[PDB]
Design an enzyme around this catalytic site. Structure first.
Site, mmCIF file in Angstrom:
data_model
loop_
_atom_site.group_PDB
_atom_site.id
_atom_site.type_symbol
_atom_site.label_atom_id
_atom_site.label_comp_id
_atom_site.label_asym_id
_atom_site.label_seq_id
_atom_site.Cartn_x
_atom_site.Cartn_y
_atom_site.Cartn_z
ATOM 1 N N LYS A 1 0.847 -1.136 0.055
ATOM 2 C CA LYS A 1 0.081 -0.232 -0.029
ATOM 3 C C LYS A 1 0.704 1.229 -0.013
ATOM 4 O O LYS A 1 1.662 1.555 0.931
ATOM 5 C CB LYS A 1 -0.946 -0.013 1.193
ATOM 6 C CG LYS A 1 -1.971 1.352 1.260
ATOM 7 C CD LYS A 1 -2.697 1.210 2.363
ATOM 8 C CE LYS A 1 -3.345 2.795 2.864
ATOM 9 N NZ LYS A 1 -4.183 2.452 4.052
ATOM 10 N N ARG B 1 -7.991 -0.141 0.487
ATOM 11 C CA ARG B 1 -8.355 -1.322 -0.208
ATOM 12 C C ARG B 1 -8.817 -0.890 -1.646
ATOM 13 O O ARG B 1 -8.566 -1.915 -2.588
ATOM 14 C CB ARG B 1 -9.549 -1.671 0.706
ATOM 15 C CG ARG B 1 -10.652 -0.756 0.551
ATOM 16 C CD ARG B 1 -11.673 -1.586 1.716
ATOM 17 N NE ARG B 1 -11.427 -1.122 3.139
ATOM 18 C CZ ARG B 1 -12.026 -1.293 4.119
ATOM 19 N NH1 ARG B 1 -13.319 -2.066 3.743
ATOM 20 N NH2 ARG B 1 -11.753 -1.004 5.228
ATOM 21 N N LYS C 1 -9.840 12.914 8.316
ATOM 22 C CA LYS C 1 -9.193 12.559 9.884
ATOM 23 C C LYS C 1 -9.464 13.813 10.847
ATOM 24 O O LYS C 1 -8.684 14.472 11.091
ATOM 25 C CB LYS C 1 -7.980 11.759 9.799
ATOM 26 C CG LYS C 1 -8.108 10.623 8.880
ATOM 27 C CD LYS C 1 -6.615 9.913 8.741
ATOM 28 C CE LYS C 1 -6.547 8.974 7.854
ATOM 29 N NZ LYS C 1 -7.259 7.636 8.480
ATOM 30 N N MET D 1 -0.072 10.321 9.364
ATOM 31 C CA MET D 1 -0.672 9.701 8.231
ATOM 32 C C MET D 1 0.526 9.898 6.896
ATOM 33 O O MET D 1 -0.065 9.567 5.756
ATOM 34 C CB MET D 1 -1.778 10.339 7.794
ATOM 35 C CG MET D 1 -2.857 9.926 8.664
ATOM 36 S SD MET D 1 -3.056 7.945 8.987
ATOM 37 C CE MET D 1 -3.873 7.953 10.135
ATOM 38 N N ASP E 1 -2.397 10.266 4.119
ATOM 39 C CA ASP E 1 -3.856 9.831 4.020
ATOM 40 C C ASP E 1 -4.601 11.065 4.718
ATOM 41 O O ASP E 1 -4.468 10.910 6.259
ATOM 42 C CB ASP E 1 -3.954 8.616 4.652
ATOM 43 C CG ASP E 1 -5.349 7.925 4.613
ATOM 44 O OD1 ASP E 1 -6.039 8.485 3.467
ATOM 45 O OD2 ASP E 1 -5.581 7.064 5.254
ATOM 46 N N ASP F 1 -1.486 13.364 11.782
ATOM 47 C CA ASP F 1 -0.044 13.989 11.677
ATOM 48 C C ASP F 1 0.896 12.727 11.276
ATOM 49 O O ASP F 1 2.061 12.978 11.000
ATOM 50 C CB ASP F 1 0.171 14.656 12.996
ATOM 51 C CG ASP F 1 0.115 13.890 14.108
ATOM 52 O OD1 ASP F 1 -0.709 12.801 14.142
ATOM 53 O OD2 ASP F 1 0.917 14.191 15.249
ATOM 54 N N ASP G 1 -12.012 7.555 3.448
ATOM 55 C CA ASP G 1 -10.886 7.175 4.382
ATOM 56 C C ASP G 1 -10.425 5.682 4.517
ATOM 57 O O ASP G 1 -9.901 5.137 5.168
ATOM 58 C CB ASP G 1 -11.073 7.732 5.665
ATOM 59 C CG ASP G 1 -9.858 7.710 6.539
ATOM 60 O OD1 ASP G 1 -8.628 7.886 6.059
ATOM 61 O OD2 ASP G 1 -9.953 7.826 7.784
HETATM 62 N N1 LIG Z 1 -14.552 1.266 9.787
HETATM 63 C C1 LIG Z 1 -13.529 2.052 9.183
HETATM 64 C C2 LIG Z 1 -14.019 3.192 8.660
HETATM 65 C C3 LIG Z 1 -13.022 4.090 7.834
HETATM 66 C C4 LIG Z 1 -11.782 3.465 7.933
HETATM 67 C C5 LIG Z 1 -11.378 2.466 8.707
HETATM 68 C C6 LIG Z 1 -9.927 2.082 8.663
HETATM 69 O O1 LIG Z 1 -9.671 1.081 8.991
HETATM 70 N N2 LIG Z 1 -9.117 3.210 8.172
HETATM 71 C C7 LIG Z 1 -7.719 3.365 7.951
HETATM 72 C C8 LIG Z 1 -7.470 3.961 6.752
HETATM 73 O O2 LIG Z 1 -7.458 5.238 6.782
HETATM 74 N N3 LIG Z 1 -7.272 3.363 5.573
HETATM 75 O O3 LIG Z 1 -6.790 3.997 4.613
HETATM 76 C C9 LIG Z 1 -6.793 3.438 9.068
HETATM 77 C C10 LIG Z 1 -7.018 4.197 10.058
HETATM 78 C C11 LIG Z 1 -6.306 4.353 11.179
HETATM 79 C C12 LIG Z 1 -4.892 3.691 11.083
HETATM 80 N N4 LIG Z 1 -4.051 3.820 11.962
HETATM 81 C C13 LIG Z 1 -2.895 3.069 12.105
HETATM 82 C C14 LIG Z 1 -2.385 3.686 13.207
HETATM 83 C C15 LIG Z 1 -2.995 4.630 13.566
HETATM 84 N N5 LIG Z 1 -3.928 4.887 12.756
HETATM 85 C C16 LIG Z 1 -4.765 2.879 9.974
HETATM 86 C C17 LIG Z 1 -5.398 2.811 8.907
HETATM 87 C C18 LIG Z 1 -12.268 1.659 9.368
HETATM 88 ZN ZN LIG Z 2 -7.603 6.083 5.017
HETATM 89 ZN ZN LIG Z 3 -4.967 4.618 4.306
#
Ligand SMILES: Nc1cccc(C(=O)N[C@@H](C(=O)NO)c2ccc(-n3cccn3)cc2)c1
Ligand SMILES: [Zn+2]
Ligand SMILES: [Zn+2]
Ligand SMILES: Nc1cccc(C(=O)N[C@@H](C(=O)NO)c2ccc(-n3cccn3)cc2)c1
Ligand SMILES: Nc1cccc(C(=O)N[C@@H](C(=O)NO)c2ccc(-n3cccn3)cc2)c1
Ligand SMILES: [Zn+2]
Ligand SMILES: [Zn+2]
Ligand SMILES: [Zn+2]
Ligand SMILES: [Zn+2]
Lengths: 515, 511, 510
Positions: free
Chosen positions: A286, A375, A298, A308, A291, A306, A371
């Site tokens: 990825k 995926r 966020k 991201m 992000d 911060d 967000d």
């Molecule tokens: N239910 C739902 C809704 C929308 C987003 C998520 C989700 O998993 N979002 C992730 C994301 O932003 N992916 O791009 C995401 C969010 C936070 C982290 N994080 C890791 C370490 C600290 N924070 C990692 C990935 C889930």
């Molecule tokens: Zn995201």
């Molecule tokens: Zn992401």
């Protein structure tokens, strides 16, 4: 490619240190059964005491110096204990009337050290290296370690010892030049030395990319770094731009980067062995350079916007693996290092919550949350990966924040559609000492991704198991190939130490090598 | 007219199906006082039992089949009850020695079925159509329904039966038979139901269509196409024209969007003396991010906000019905100030003071209250047309969900007679609407220190009323009513639009 | 009867002021025809300009040369009629006696609304509070009906009066009124005084803090009032309430140190009774919300002493009814009074409880305690065999998002009763708007284990859902529900309105 700027002060490349101080350290390995020479620099004994916790210090190794041996005798050392993490400095004059510096690091009372315990020992050793202008370090193993744990010691030493000052200007401020290692059956361990040094940089390389801020590390500048890395390793490379992505119909991936000033760049590096091929492997990371969350910004408490810049950790790990592979050069194997790099931003051009987008395999997707963009990128990358016709597809990604609630900051999660590949990832975990745990892809949750209008929902409405739901979504884009998914959102960044880990480099490389 | 893209894979038009499978259904209406015959397909008896709650099923109608009649004896049906929504399937051989399918839907114990209840009957009936490869449906009415409720049954049947697959990648009936007492008068309701059905379903297609498909350019293009397929006058006002008309409040909202503002003006004129001129105004926000007042709060439901042009969809759906039915002695204006509310460097800011086309300066206290701003300039435009009635329909306030909920839309206005006509239209169209007050005491909270008026209130939390108070400032001397459909536009349980407003506005225009 | 204490410094009764200075005001009403006399105190003209923010013009003849000179158009055109704007000047009259003359602007609209008239009175009272006047004279140069005139007097009296019962560390004695057709208005004067105190009595109960106003002391107050008015009374204690099987109401009070107290006051006419009415008021002396604590931002737990405003309104009505003594009616004044607290003895979220009509209720939210107390009150009320049941309650906070702070909502099962309320709203000038009980929402109250849910999990139309709930507890009687949660407390003025007293009284009398 040329990196777009808003102002002329905007950086147009990622600063990368190839020639690190670690690479200049000459490493010597000796057998303990010949005795230890104690001279210039700092000589440290790794000592434990099996059974009796916080037991007294005992030095087993023969020291080829009468003065030092008298100092290190049991009667003298008994006042010190082996509490894991404990360290002491010794000062004395040797047989040749020269002042020498000796010491030890306590390795507890458990005969078998875990990968975490080992890190604690190394961190204690690094403390002795910091704020001390040493020309040479000597380590004496009076503990039982296998070849892998020994290599892990060296890698961890090399990693933690190293300090990133790429973005320091007015606030800077001598590494050792020699590293001596005494250990039983030394001949059996020598082979691990250069492997450790190679694994060190692969990990440290990924670390530099993850640590680099999003204005330095953007999709254009990151893909540029990949080209530069491929050129130095003689890897085949292909960097796909927007025009190529459009004709390849990568609608899911293209959507995420719509609102960015930086065009999307798809990295495709390939290592092919000079012998007849037996296995073909695709490694997908990825690569979201920043992000922000998109219109699902966020902004919620604890969303950590911060941090991201970390969101391309998977891409970094894959590129680091590319360094380890292109350097060690494994035979009879072909590897593809892939990453769909883009930036998830808020703009008039951004994609919207509710938008329906078409992945390259024809599947229509309803975006319920911008967000959850990782995926979406991975979807088009996975389709691309399978089109290459490989035996194994493995993706690594900072995909879900829920991983901090499941496995925490120490263990990564592995999901997949093929049990043997999963077991192969888990074996790679053990031999790399990068902890990974197997988590299920619960099919009962699949129904929650059934969209009313689209072919499939990006996210689930009901199910709160986002790490599993996300895996269900990804599996829909791998038709008939063994595939594994590694979630490193929890373990990629070292929160207490305020730095990246470069997690995944050594694990993916062991996977490539041991297969 | 040309839809701007970011990438080539971006859509440049809204997919619209005009000829539905519902249009391919041949519908016959017979009088029950002649007997029912069965034979092919599935035959369903709508039955009830006045008095007894779960009383037994009693088939009263004459069946032109000895076998089917013997099977439908009271003694045989006695084991079944008429609980509202209950359904059963029967298998048997008729006099022709052919296998036939028969069954019933329970219509409760009450003599007069309600709108909510009739929908429950239909949904139960539609369930019987979804899992079976039937070539023909026959429905026998052994309950009492007036012409409006009968039409409602057909509309609701057609709507819930049809499935939208425009955005899917990876067998409807062809005949519908209806047995009914006093059949000759119900017959005219059939094609009216078909027209009402599509006007509603046309609206839903637009609303359901995501915001990357349905943008201010593509939506206005769709309206032009609709206007051309009918024969309504049409003009789409562009930014240049909108600048000349000084619609600053409307132009401000769309500043942060990659799609240029498009003002939709459709017109239907009767071929005779016009006795009533009417202006229909639909809120047409293709996507509502909230602007810099971003929808980030828990419960703001941003992923739904493609529905924020439901008011426009309702108005366009009415234009189809009016265009098809060709009413007399009227001139209808179908209006919608369409734009998109986005976050950008070009977006308008909270605090900005903007000038409406009627000259009034407006202090923006919240960018997410953007609907009333586009409406304000649309209301000024509508009154300049010199009409008798101005009616606007909009997904304006989230407070509607706390006041009336998800079934009843709210209506506001400055004229009791006009309100009465809307309430009347609510009854005959069976799209429920409740009258809510414009409390003038709250008006003082719209006083600004620098602008002529505040966009939002300071103290009052009754936003659906405060918004109504803001709208009233832009109609000086014309009977005006406001319909807030933010609560009822989206069917959350079914995960689809209702197409709410189409039938109400049409009933209003026709009668 | 005896109020329990934690410490000896805890209050054991609600301080009430019955004889207010307002009752010492001698009110005379004259006809404008014949001219106005200016001799003492303050004289205020109520002036409009039917334009916007138009100049002030005095039409009335003043039998004093000096004041007439002050009131000439050249002087008064310097001022404007912006609704609520006032000026007043001190000057000597023909008798060389000090007088004060001024006006209150009444805007540009001919027919003043109840909201408009209140802003006028507030401007009038402002002048009253900072001048040591012996006499106020109000000259009506605007048009008001009998009802709006009485409403003017009630509101004047209510805003003028200052509650100082909890303060520790000179009202006028004469009120003059010049108005066209003065004779028809005189009979409204004493009625205004009665309606004022009924409203003020109620406000006294609402403003009284929860340590002063508790279930015991509040019921004690009701008895004291019932005795002064010669109304028969009955206070039901816990033992009676248990024999009546009032589980819903008793559940709510479980976590309180104050025992539940059911107030039942009755007014009977000497004449043959032709109508029987039961008025039900929500009587929660304090609402912390229970284990579903009011802890969210904007839950306003510091207000929640108001949660017995319904009971206060009912008692306020009881004063008016017992005073004006209507004929051919029997009125029952009811309130199931208790306190909603957090304790080891409190009812929990999830609990299933049995109302006195046998209906089992699954409690989904302890903060929705109002409808539970009301359930057993409505059951009790129907058992009296009445023609009308009207409850009045600070029941749903959602009212603030529907109607806001000025209009109360009314729900019901009978169209004629609701219209009778709506008419009473018109004649009492306490604004009430009719709201629908949407049956399509009923299914959300279908409990999985109980006969019925207390609340809905999905539907956010809280006021309508709560109306459906209460509807389950009235089997065959005309019933109307007034949700006064949004209008009870005057937030801007930081005090109760005593809303509902005049409304319910007009309902009983007309
Ligand atoms: N239910 C739902 C809704 C929308 C987003 C998520 C989700 O998993 N979002 C992730 C994301 O932003 N992916 O791009 C995401 C969010 C936070 C982290 N994080 C890791 C370490 C600290 N924070 C990692 C990935 C889930
Ligand atoms: Zn995201
Ligand atoms: Zn992401
Ligand atoms: N006071 C004030 C402040 C800021 C926004 C509003 C407001 O009414 N906002 C509305 C809006 O966004 N209009 O464009 C709005 C908000 C939510 C919904 N909603 C419907 C279904 C679910 N949610 C609908 C409209 C009012
Ligand atoms: N569904 C559901 C869940 C939880 C609470 C309610 C609800 O309506 N609760 C009311 C209550 O506490 N009754 O005892 C209630 C009553 C009044 C206010 N209020 C706020 C400001 C002024 N008044 C707030 C809440 C409903
Ligand atoms: Zn908005
Ligand atoms: Zn909107
Ligand atoms: Zn409560
Ligand atoms: Zn309460």
């Amino acid at each position: 490619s040329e990196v777009p700027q808003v102002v002329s002060l905007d950086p147009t490349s990622i600063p990368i240190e190839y020639n690190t101080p670690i690479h200049d350290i000459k490493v010597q390995v000796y057998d303990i059964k010949g005795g230890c020479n104690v001279e210039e620099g700092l000589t440290i004994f790794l000592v434990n005491n099996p059974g009796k916790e916080n037991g007294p210090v005992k030095i087993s190794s023969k020291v080829n110096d009468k003065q030092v041996s008298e100092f290190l005798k049991d009667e003298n050392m008994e006042k010190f204990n082996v509490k894991l993490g404990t360290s002491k400095h010794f000062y004395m004059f040797n047989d040749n009337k020269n002042s020498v510096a000796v010491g030890y690091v306590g390795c507890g009372s458990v005969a078998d050290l875990s990968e975490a315990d080992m890190k604690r020992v190394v961190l204690s050793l690094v403390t002795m290296l910091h704020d001390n202008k040493l020309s040479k370090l000597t380590v004496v193993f009076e503990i039982n370690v296998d070849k892998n744990l020994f290599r892990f010691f060296l890698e961890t030493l090399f990693y933690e010892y190293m300090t990133d000052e790429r973005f320091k200007s007015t606030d800077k401020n001598e590494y050792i030049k020699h590293l001596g290692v005494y250990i039983n059956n030394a001949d059996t361990y020598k082979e691990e030395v250069e492997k450790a040094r190679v694994y060190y940089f692969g990990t440290y390389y990924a670390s530099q990319l993850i640590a680099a801020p999003s204005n330095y590390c953007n999709p254009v500048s990151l893909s540029n770094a990949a080209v530069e890395l491929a050129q130095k390793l003689n890897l085949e490379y292909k960097i796909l731009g927007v025009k190529e992505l459009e004709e390849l119909k990568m609608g899911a991936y293209l959507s995420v980067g719509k609102g960015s000033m930086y065009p999307n760049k798809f990295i495709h590096l390939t290592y092919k062995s000079k012998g007849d091929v037996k296995k073909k492997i695709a490694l997908v990371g990825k690569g979201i350079t920043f992000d922000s969350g998109g219109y699902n910004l966020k902004a919620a408490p604890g969303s950590m916007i911060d941090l991201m810049k970390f969101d391309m950790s998977g891409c970094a790990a894959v590129l680091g693996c590319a360094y380890c592979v292109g350097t060690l050069k494994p035979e009879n194997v072909e590897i593809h290092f892939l990453s769909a790099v883009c930036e998830n931003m808020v703009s008039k051009n951004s994609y919207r919550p509710g938008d329906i987008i078409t992945a390259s395999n024809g599947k229509t997707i309803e975006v319920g949350n911008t967000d959850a963009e990782g995926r979406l990128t991975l979807a088009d990358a996975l389709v691309y990966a399978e089109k290459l016709g490989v035996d194994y597809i493995v993706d690594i990604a900072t995909l879900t924040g829920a991983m901090l609630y499941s496995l925490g900051t120490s263990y990564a999660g592995v999901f997949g559609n093929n049990e043997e590949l999963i077991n192969k990832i888990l074996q790679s975990s053990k031999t790399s000492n990068e902890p990974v745990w197997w988590l299920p892809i619960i099919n009962e949750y699949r129904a929650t991704l059934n969209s009313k209008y689209a072919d499939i929902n990006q996210i689930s409405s009901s199910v709160k198991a986002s790490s599993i739901v996300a895996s269900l979504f990804l599996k829909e884009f791998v038709q008939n190939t063994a595939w594994a998914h590694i979630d490193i959102a929890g373990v990629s960044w070292n929160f207490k130490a305020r730095k990246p880990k470069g997690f995944g480099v050594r694990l993916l490389t062991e996977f490539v090598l041991n297969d």
